[PDB]
């Protein structure tokens, strides 16, 4: 159920990063579904169509997308219920132990 058919495949996704001046690593973002709309550091998910933007030096390219995007189902299968929920949990843990 691919919200963007034509870059459903890894070579058309890296192939978006071409003139990538961000240093969020291009093969990481193609990997985890993402591909960039020359927009910015703008990407878009091509299989739940989320959008991501403003990364910033520390960001896994995975661990953003099961943060804003759970519901996807390339995720899914990528990384697995048990990945997703951790992350969810994990931003749980942290506003609940700083004070
Ligand atoms: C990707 C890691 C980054 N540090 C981050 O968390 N960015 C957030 C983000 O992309 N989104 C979350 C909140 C804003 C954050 C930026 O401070 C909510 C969902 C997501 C988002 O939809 N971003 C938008 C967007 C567009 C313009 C300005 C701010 C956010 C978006 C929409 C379409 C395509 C790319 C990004
Ligand atoms: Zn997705």
């Not at 093969?27 to 910015?40: D, I, K, N, P, W």
């Not at 550091?41 to 739940?48: E, T």
Request: charged share 25%; aromatic share 14%.
């Amino acid at each position: 159920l691919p919200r963007n058919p034509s870059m459903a495949d890894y070579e058309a996704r890296i192939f978006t990063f071409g003139t990538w001046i961000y240093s969020v690593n291009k093969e990481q973002l193609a990997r985890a579904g993402f591909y960039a709309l020359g927009e910015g550091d703008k990407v878009k998910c091509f299989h739940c169509g989320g959008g991501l933007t403003d990364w910033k030096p520390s960001e896994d390219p995975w661990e953003q997308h099961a943060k804003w995007y759970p519901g996807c189902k390339y995720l899914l299968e990528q990384k697995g219920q048990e990945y997703i929920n951790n992350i969810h949990l994990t931003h749980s843990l942290e506003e609940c132990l700083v004070r």
